[PDB]
Assembly symmetry: D2
Homo-oligomer: 498 residues x 4
């Protein structure tokens, strides 16, 4: 039982040596320099996130270039993620550029674009034409990231609602609008996003963090916008509102991965329901074996302070215990005073949660919900992890070209490193969002075809020795194909390190 496991925990015991969870950092003026990025990497950043809400292509090019230089200097494979702006709903402009509201104020909000630039206390524009279908009398409209709240009192015509203002607030031009609990018929990709994705495909980004994903169809439209050139780039769908949460099954099926985008999600649904959504989404991703990232405000106060709050420490530990592959930092590294320290704390907190995790409970829980019969690669991979628990293996080793087999092994949550020997650099970079995985690159152009796996396996066992994952006489669990089977691994071996 979780309870019996808890009572036997010890704060004094040494912790795990090898961090399993992974850390995504948002780059910004605190962290964009090659020097900054090197330290971020030494501190534990696995994936660098470019937030295309802010900054020009020129700005993000510097990030891309600096990340590549920083990683090349340290001999690391660091993923690069493009996080789209996404479509949005905004108010119009106001006269004199602002208006102040008070509780009780009645205000008409209109979908008539005539009113776009002449917002007053009495009447202002919202640029979502379907508005008077999507929110009914009694429903709420949230303005400015939830900070001001309107109750719809009535529909005046097919383009205008009379609303009641709930709280004091000062609006400036073009504030964000959220419609909590309303379906929202905005396109998966805005015009700006197309140019942003085109840029990402051209610069060879490893993954898109796709904003405001509400339906599987929208994931497909993002895949389509990436076209043939970008067919290999991961799509990590950001779950940001109620529809996202409702359609999670079919969104998970269409995506390569998920981000629990708690910031927007906590505006769209009550803040307290975000923990329910988080637990549900992470677990559902664990069940199908797709990477999931927990995001937003995890270590917020470290934007300004050199130590985190108690709440913050528990937030990170709990996202790890919930089952998340990755945890993420935004402002904390984009613009905070302590980018290095914050990543270091997050690394330490991860390691503690990892050591306090019951080894085999995830493995069993996950395995028990799989449909039987399994595909044989998945039987090979789960049973490899089982056999890793049985011999207390110190590492596993898998040959994966696309990353599929590595993600399949990580799905079953071994308690040791998963060394992945791959033939694609992009795969080394993409496996950064997968718990436990450590990539080594095998250069076929330079060392040859390796039909019988022996060179890739040697390379992996040498890496295991060098990185101090295991030593001479330790058992490693090795997964690849036999001499004739092609396209997936059908073989597991137990090998003593020579």
């Amino acid at each position: 039982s979780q309870l019996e496991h808890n009572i036997g925990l010890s704060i004094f015991e040494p912790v795990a040596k090898h961090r399993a969870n992974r850390i995504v950092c948002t780059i910004g003026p605190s962290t964009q320099s090659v020097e900054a990025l090197k330290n971020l990497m030494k501190s534990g950043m696995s994936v660098a996130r470019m937030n295309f809400s802010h900054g020009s292509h020129e700005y993000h090019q510097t990030t891309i270039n600096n990340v590549r230089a920083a990683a090349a200097e340290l001999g690391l494979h660091i993923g690069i993620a493009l996080d789209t702006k996404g479509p949005e709903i905004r108010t119009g402009l106001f006269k004199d550029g602002e208006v102040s509201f008070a509780p009780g104020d009645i205000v008409c909000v209109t979908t008539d674009p005539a009113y776009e630039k002449v917002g007053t206390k009495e009447k202002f524009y919202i640029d979502y034409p379907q508005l008077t279908n999507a929110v009914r009398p009694g429903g709420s409209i949230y303005v400015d990231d939830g900070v001001m709240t309107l109750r719809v009192v009535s529909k005046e015509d097919d383009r205008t609602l009379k609303c009641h203002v709930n709280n004091h607030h000062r609006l400036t031009d073009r504030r964000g609008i959220n419609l909590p609990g309303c379906e929202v018929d905005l396109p998966a990709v805005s015009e700006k996003d197309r140019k942003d994705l085109e840029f990402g495909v051209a610069q060879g980004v490893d993954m898109i963090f796709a904003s405001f994903i509400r339906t599987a169809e929208q994931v497909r439209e993002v895949r389509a916008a990436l076209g043939e050139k970008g067919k290999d780039i991961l799509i990590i769908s950001k779950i940001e509102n109620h529809q996202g949460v409702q359609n999670i099954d079919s969104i998970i099926e269409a995506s390569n991965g998920i981000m629990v985008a708690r910031g927007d999600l906590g505006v769209e649904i009550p803040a307290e329901k975000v923990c329910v959504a988080q637990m549900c989404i992470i677990s559902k991703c664990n069940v199908v074996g797709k990477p999931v990232i927990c995001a937003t405000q995890m270590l917020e106060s470290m934007t300004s302070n050199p130590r985190p709050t108690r709440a913050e420490v528990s937030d990170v530990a709990n996202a790890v215990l919930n089952g998340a592959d990755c945890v993420m930092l935004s402002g904390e590294t984009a613009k905070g005073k302590y980018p290095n320290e914050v990543v270091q704390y997050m690394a330490r907190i991860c390691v503690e949660a990892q050591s306090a995790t019951h080894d085999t409970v995830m493995f069993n829980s996950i395995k028990n919900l799989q449909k039987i019969p399994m595909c044989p690669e998945e039987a090979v991979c789960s049973s490899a992890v089982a056999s890793a628990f049985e011999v207390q293996a110190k590492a596993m080793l898998v040959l994966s070209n696309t990353g599929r087999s590595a993600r399949l092994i990580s799905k079953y949550r071994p308690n040791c490193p998963i060394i992945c020997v791959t033939t694609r650099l992009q795969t080394c970079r993409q496996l950064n969002v997968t718990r436990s995985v450590v990539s080594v690159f095998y250069d076929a152009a330079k060392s040859g075809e390796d039909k019988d796996k022996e060179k890739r396996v040697k390379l992996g066992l040498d890496f295991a020795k060098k990185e101090k994952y295991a030593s001479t006489g330790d058992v490693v669990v090795v997964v690849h194909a036999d001499h004739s089977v092609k396209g997936y691994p059908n073989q597991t071996r137990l090998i003593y390190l020579p």
Copy 2:
């Protein structure tokens, strides 16, 4: 499995209507008026904490009187908790009220009272006379809830240490000092603590939150200080340092309950380990059925903001999921701008986490760890909870005079309210730290002896009806003694509301 429970969670289901978990609020300037307290109570405060780190007896008397007046106006039983100063270590004053420190700043710290009021960038006072025995050269002194370090360069003399400042801090009056990994030899009950405890007995406080408890011995010292007239007052031991966590088992056995005092704890041990201690301590308390409070920085940002961070919501929810009876607010209500709102958020987060909790997992885990044979009253109480699950009872009803039986039912974590009819007002107030329990006072001196229990059961069933727990025809599980057993409950009944 936890995983299978998670994938079935929904954000679209209604939540529980009756909050099981309980909220402790610290009273200060924001919240001391009769009016402010009434609103805290309405917002969901169950226990008012007096922090005797600060304030005179007279100040706390005003708190005690105003709590009683507010509780009487609303007809509530609200516990009053005295939280001791304990073996605290603080700085003196500074000229002007701050000084500011740069890294590499070399500073003299002195135990010499002479410098108490007159501290500067160069020399200042610390109120622990044995300082230069406690920490030697190369040791570290933590300052102001851990936000600034000093390394000790040398012992100047028996009164003065020369110290290297390690980082960047602006330092206000009388701030907290911690000395992790140092033999600090201060009493659990200082002379000042002894007066405060006597004042609490005199004033009839319901519970002591005993600071820095390190040993079962220290708990007993707090018991002795309370004397004869004070023997029914709960002692809740605050676990705040390394040694508290080491000795947790015998500390629990001596105490009436525990507070995981995450503030000092997260300075005294590495901050990332607090999450492991929390889990471990809460579960150990759940196992012996003793109340446990999770404290400190839970909704910290709401000290200044109208909304909590995503980390803070999850921190609260996870304290509840961990098994904590109570969650605590400190600065958030003592001195924040939004005391009522912060209590309201906490109450809503509690209810969400309570609704995401698997019905019976706690029941079974707790039961499976109990030594067999049980005492009869424990067999009756655990079986009563089982039968509540089986009939889907909307409430339970227990007669308890000392509170023991109410705590015993609560130990088995039913999913419905536990209505406790008690013959002591103090029991009503002390049961505010126990998950699920709602108290009704039966005045035996005024209404008679009730040997056959029909008066008290009627009172509790009518309360069930009035407070909208159950209605006519609903089953209620009713626990007390039969007509001849005295001293504990030997009987369970299932009863339909008339």
Copy 3:
């Protein structure tokens, strides 16, 4: 796990003192005398079975009278069961009273009653008019308790099948016929059965063992034949063929109990499938809490030998481990040389299987399959049994007039005696087919109404002391109603024996 429980079993430990399972004995020339029956009773017979296949009413009257005299002498309550002949299918007569068949012999079997008395090698009668609808070409007809086998080769006309003889056998007049796997449209009650049931109702039998029950409707026709005078007599349906097994759910719902009539069942379905049927039927009865009897050849060789075969010992142990309330003896006591010894062995074997049973596994398994919400009497009863495991109670005590509450408690398979204080003698007799139950009679006509239960409870606790179930200072779990609830028990108490 069953496996871990097994490896820790010990043959050397003392066994349970109080036999939980119950023994049904068939009376016959070995055992009909008052003296014989007294010894049978001392040996462990709980229910005496009269097989109305053989003997006249006069014969069975002697059994009834002798059983009553024998029981009255020993002060026991012994159930009396009437086991119907049931409808049957038979061949006609043969010329010269017999015919011999050989493998390969072709024989017409006809439904034309003209051929009733003139059976030959070539052609003989079977008295089931629907025969040529019920068994198709390729199907089998079993003759003489399965000993000879015919394959239907073809239908000649609507009353005649050509059949192939499978094995050597000699037929005499009017042998039994079975149609394996065929629906069989015979009435629930034959004419002879009506007169037999009428007799049973008049003589006050406690239960019918109803033969050849195929459908719930047939159980209802047996209840109807018992009329108003016999509305209180248990109907234990004998499951004897494939239809019985197929319709078991709805047959269990209609009956008071089940007999796995392995003898006929092993003729109708392959002998090896009888173990599957047995395990399934017993478990299904356990799940709904209805008594189930395992029957036939359990200790067969003891008909002639003074010790049982190894197979036989395991058969009895395994019926107990499967979950059967009762095991039964036929020939072994009706006509065998060692009626006393055989019942003694069966008692000893039961006790060993009981002691080797894992206490709480049945309890948990049974409780886990109940629909929630439960009726409150069933919550009271399961939780009483739970609380009996928790305090290691040595007995339970329940007030039951119809026997319902006692059967409800036994359903949850406590490891101790269940003392039932009843106001009906017939209930004492009927509870003999219920595991663990020991009945005491409370005479209301002579000691008064006992509205507050105290006299019945005293009587029960006195019985517990006298029979050496428990002594002074032991906990007994007591189940009845409180002072106002009528018709079921809503209360459980734990009481120390004074």
Copy 4:
């Protein structure tokens, strides 16, 4: 749960097509001809047992030769088991060949050979010279598989005891004597046993069934008697008395397997305890993965009848459900009228019980009891079985030379056949006592070394196809070493049948 598994059982589903459990048959007059043995093999015999209690070397030579000739004709590998006389105690002869005893009959028993041939109602011979040291006055002497008792009245002299006959028996030549609770001091290897064991080594028998094993020491004495040339012969220890059961753990550790010898056991300890010993012993063997045979009176009545009793069918089925690898026939095939039919029933009952077995319950129970870390080959074998469940494999295929790896896979109780390709004919024969294993011989001397395993795997896959275990496109789980590991299997593969 077992209960929930049972209620889902059906008698209408098809049964397993490949029998997992294995049948040992004792050879005698009924069954010694080459023809009779061919039919036993066709009917399902896997191991022929020679009972050296009776018969000369020459008689057993005929058995050995005829088994080989019959097995060769059919192309089967059939094990040959030598079952020792051991420390047996028998009566002498009687004039005429019976005498008959009445209760109260006072009789002299004598160790004096003089009376060997000439026994009467009054005096007869017992071949244990230390008799009058072993049992003293008031002790009991059991005679002829326990069917008749004598109490010892006095020691006449060192050669003669006066005995009270307790019951009614007709006594044939050279019948078995048991002395429960007596210090009987006879060697595990008599002079006669030593010759028999040497003859078995000379003749190349596959296994010894060692009678009356009492200690691990005795097992080692049987090992030493087998000498150098005999070291690969299995020793299966027969547990037959009180002390065997006491010492079961260290007896198992010394042996290659165990027989629960229920015949002598059920006389040496009370007969009702045998069912507890059986369960306990079989499970302990399953836990260390050593073969266990359940023996004696399993289908006893079929010695004379064409059909078994209901008890005997359930006895067989429950031996299988208990975990037994093998079930044994004694008199049923040595001397019965229906040897072929009795083997056929047993085979059908085995398959039913196998089909009623829960797939994975045994796998998990066995796995959960193994010390971690496992040796690599055990992690490979248990994980191979797990992956068989997960892909619903129709067969497994393992390379085994000694049989160790085949027994290791079998220990984890897969639900499909385990095809074992072995390089030793003796391994083929010895694996007949292991559940599920089907052997194929690869003649390395004739077909070459097969370092890369492709020859043996091809041989086993073609066997899978020929024997109708799997077909083209079916997955098979294949266990052996990779290209460089020697001594055990370190590799698992999933392979589709070509």
